[PDB]
Amino acid sequence: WIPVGELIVLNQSTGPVGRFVYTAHVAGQRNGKVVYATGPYLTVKDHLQDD
Amino acid sequence: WIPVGELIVLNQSTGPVGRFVYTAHVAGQRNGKVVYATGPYLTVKDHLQDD
Amino acid sequence: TWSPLAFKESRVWDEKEILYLGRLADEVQAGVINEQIAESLTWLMARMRNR
């Protein structure tokens, strides 16, 4: 991962540098409205009544 | 609505001239049989899972 | 004899508006389109009256 012959150098403090934000996506139809969820999501598509 | 130089004569009597007839439209599958309604219908489409 | 008439119309909202829709003054979360759908709902309700 660290390329051979090249080194990173931290400067201030060995700690966290920023945060990996997520962003909301679309889920649907709570009652007649939309509901948004933040992180990763896995939606299925049950087309077992299709041809 | 009536123009400025016009007027509507009603002849026979004061009251309703004719009627406004609602016929039947299709409402989907209340039971195994098909059901029907008459008035102005309004439905939504939940395509909040497709891509 | 007599025969009625039919009046239908559609109205859609794509992903980019249903996900990215806040306000102008405030830092409101993305759930604004669930409030803005009801306006077009009652507008189609009031537009079937005009025919």
Return the C-alpha torsion angle C17, C23, C29, C31, nearest 10.
-50
Contact of C39 with chain A, judged by CB distance below 8 Å, is answered with no
Q: Which residues in chain A have their CB less than 8 angstroms from residue B49's CB?
A: 28, 43, 45
Q: Which DSSP letter does residue A35 get? A: E
Interface of B with C (CB under 8 A): 21, 23, 40, 42, 48
Q: Which pairs with CB-CB distance under 8 Å and at least 24 residues apart come from A13-22? A: none
Check if the beta carbon of residue C11 is closer than 8 Å to that of residue C44: yes
Structure solved via: cryo-EM
The owner of tokens 């306006």 is: C39
Check if the beta carbon of residue C8 is closer than 8 Å to that of residue B43: no
Q: Which residues of A17-35 are buried (b: 16+ CB within 10 A; e: fewer)?
A: eeeeeeeeebeeeeeeebe
